Structure 1
Amino acid sequence: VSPPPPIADEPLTVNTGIYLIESYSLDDCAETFKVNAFLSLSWKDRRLAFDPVRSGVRVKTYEPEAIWIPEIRFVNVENARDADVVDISVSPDGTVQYLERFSARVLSPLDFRRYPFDSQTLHIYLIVRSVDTRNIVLAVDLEKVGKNDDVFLTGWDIESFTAVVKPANFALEDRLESKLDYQLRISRQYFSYIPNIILPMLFILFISWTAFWSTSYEANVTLVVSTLIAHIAFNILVETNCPKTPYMTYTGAIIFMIYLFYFVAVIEVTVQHYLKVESQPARAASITRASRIAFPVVFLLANIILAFLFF
């Protein structure tokens, strides 16, 4: 219950590995994800060394309480991980092979600027604090790093689960702290977003555009203002249920542009009727005819400008 002594003035190397068993509950609002995995740890504690001849065993098993185990913590976790030690195996040279199953709700920022065509890199930061008698440094054993094939996140494609092999060693509260970065790369499954969100939202806008093939101000006011109600009602229906993104998103710019188009279409309908009343039906009919091409063309062009700006 004290760290192993150094042979010379070298730090203790704790080789790590994370193997994803299950990944679940990716919360976009909270920017958190719950993960269930193995955490394999390996280090040399020469005090535990033995002769397999005298012992009559080629490997010894210990209880966590019986031996020194490094305090590995996660940097970006809500509460400490719920861990269960699966196995502890000591070889005759004193090499400890530790294995545990943990479940953790990890906090990792998400960038929704390119939503719903966005990709994310989920982080899991391992950390070890160095002690009084010696310094502890983390390492990655790539043979011990991977993910179960059945690992899934509904609406996401799990690209890869890797680790940045080089640790970040730094001083914190007068002690060395070695930090490791485990990355889970995911890309969104945006298929049903076209028929369920985009297409019906465009149909409602297109219905407002039929006021350019009508001279009735009463029918035109009912067209543009009722489609604005239908649009707002449709936005409540497809609402993300997360608090509004403080920054401007791709989908957010399109929806803002759609609100601008309902305002510009009201301005046209109001101008058309005012010119018709103010004995100028030549200008009223020429504006309404221009709008039939101007509205879809300006819309198509502005969407290409946004798509270019965001991608």
Structure 2
Amino acid sequence: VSPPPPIADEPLTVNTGIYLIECYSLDDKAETFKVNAFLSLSWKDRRLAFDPVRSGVRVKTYEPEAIWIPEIRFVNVENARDADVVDISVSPDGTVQYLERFSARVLSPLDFRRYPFDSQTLHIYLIVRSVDTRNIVLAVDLEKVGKNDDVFLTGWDIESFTAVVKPANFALEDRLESKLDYQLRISRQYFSYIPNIILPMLFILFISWTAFWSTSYEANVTLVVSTLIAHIAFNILVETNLPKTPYMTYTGAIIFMIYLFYFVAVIEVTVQHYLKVESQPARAASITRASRIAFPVVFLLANIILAFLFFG
């Protein structure tokens, strides 16, 4: 119909609230997730007031096409939400209670600096646009914000679901707008990464390090290059999941360090064989004895330094 008119100049306040039902399909590469929740709205319309005694009823039920309903939209969605109306009720003083169930796909950036052990915050933005006759603002109803106990995300742990009470008011396309922020905090389940990726990689590296206790050139070459091939296959498998980022991450640094270590091991084997052929066995023995202790200690120190750099 038409937005309600003020007494003198006051803005119209709409109280909102979101109750989560389902959360699924978190795509790391596309930075998307899908949601299924309740949307609650409430405002005051004095034109709908009635006398309970004369009417003989306490609550009046309306239809969406029979009264004025504010237009609320989500900002970071791929398309408009698929919503259906559940209930509309009017109090004797004119207060309207609105409820609906929707479904939508949300876009939200992610941070991968600590990819196996990272935490993320997902954002949902609600906006309303002011009409040429009235100014509309948004508020938060704290008793209508929550989530179901059966909400589960495959691979993540859900911590909290709150909202920022203070809205943001600005001007866009020669009109005023109000924005609300709903935040969902999640943590990644990293248990499966240890025995699936972390430990076999260490085993393969330790297997490659056995060339320092041998003097056969062909066996050393075979060991080191074959372990390198296995490392390449594991790196391809891991990289199939991580997206491309404009910064450095923990896993990428570790993989690059492993490549560097393989290169240095090849150089050491080559040097030892060259010295042995040149009839200098003592120097080659000394070099291989040094390397036997040098490689693991440097690996451990570099890993400690990287862990401090990325998590400290």
> Shared fold by TM > 0.5?
yes
Cα distance in 1 for partners of 2:55, 2:277 equals: 106
Cα distance in 1 for partners of 2:240, 2:63 equals: 48
Cα distance in 1 for partners of 2:267, 2:182 equals: 54
Provide the residue aligned with 1:104 in structure 2.
Answer: 104
- Range 10-19 or range 270-279, more displaced: 270-279
What are the within-5 Å matches in structure 2 for residues 1-311 of structure 1?
Answer: 1-241=1-241, 243-311=243-311
Quote how far apart the aligned CAs of 1:279 are: 2.5
Cα distance in 1 for partners of 2:286, 2:46 equals: 92
- Range 49-58 or range 137-146, more displaced: 49-58
1:40-95 Cα deviation digits (max 9, x unpaired): 01111111111112222211111111111111111111111111111111111111
* Conserved 8 A contact 2:60-2:91: yes
Cα distance in 2 for partners of 1:240, 1:233 equals: 11
Quote how far apart the aligned CAs of 1:144 are: 0.5
Unaligned runs of 5+ in 2: none
1:89-144 Cα deviation digits (max 9, x unpaired): 11111111111111111101110111111000000011101110011101000100
- Range 244-253 or range 143-152, more displaced: 244-253
- Range 21-30 or range 265-274, more displaced: 265-274
Relative to the length of structure 2, the TM-score reads 0.97
1:220-241 Cα deviation digits (max 9, x unpaired): 1111110010111122334444
Cα distance in 1 for partners of 2:259, 2:247 equals: 18
1:238-297 Cα deviation digits (max 9, x unpaired): 444454333211111111111111111111111111121222222211121111111111
Cα distance in 2 for partners of 1:8, 1:257 equals: 70
Structure 2 counterpart SS, 1:120? strand
Unaligned runs of 5+ in 1: none
Q: 1:194–1:297: structure 2 CA closer, same or farther, 3 Å change rule?
A: same
What is the RMSD of the two structures over their aligned residues, measured on CA atoms? 1.2
Cα distance in 1 for partners of 2:17, 2:290 equals: 65
- Range 110-119 or range 243-252, more displaced: 243-252
Cα distance in 2 for partners of 1:281, 1:3 equals: 95
Quote how far apart the aligned CAs of 1:163 are: 0.3
Cα distance in 1 for partners of 2:188, 2:51 equals: 54
Structure 2 counterpart SS, 1:66? coil
- Range 284-293 or range 164-173, more displaced: 284-293
Cα distance in 1 for partners of 2:283, 2:51 equals: 102
* Conserved 8 A contact 2:28-2:243: no
Cα distance in 2 for partners of 1:56, 1:227 equals: 84
Structure 2 counterpart SS, 1:38? strand
Cα distance in 2 for partners of 1:177, 1:240 equals: 42
Cα distance in 1 for partners of 2:82, 2:283 equals: 73
Cα distance in 1 for partners of 2:39, 2:258 equals: 49
Cα distance in 2 for partners of 1:124, 1:174 equals: 24
Quote how far apart the aligned CAs of 1:201 are: 1.2
Quote how far apart the aligned CAs of 1:310 are: 0.9
Cα distance in 2 for partners of 1:35, 1:310 equals: 32
1:8-34 Cα deviation digits (max 9, x unpaired): 211111100000001000111111110
Structure 2 counterpart SS, 1:76? coil
Cα distance in 2 for partners of 1:7, 1:252 equals: 63
Moved over 6 A (4+): none
Cα distance in 1 for partners of 2:235, 2:229 equals: 10
* Conserved 8 A contact 2:164-2:180: yes
- Range 48-57 or range 10-19, more displaced: 48-57
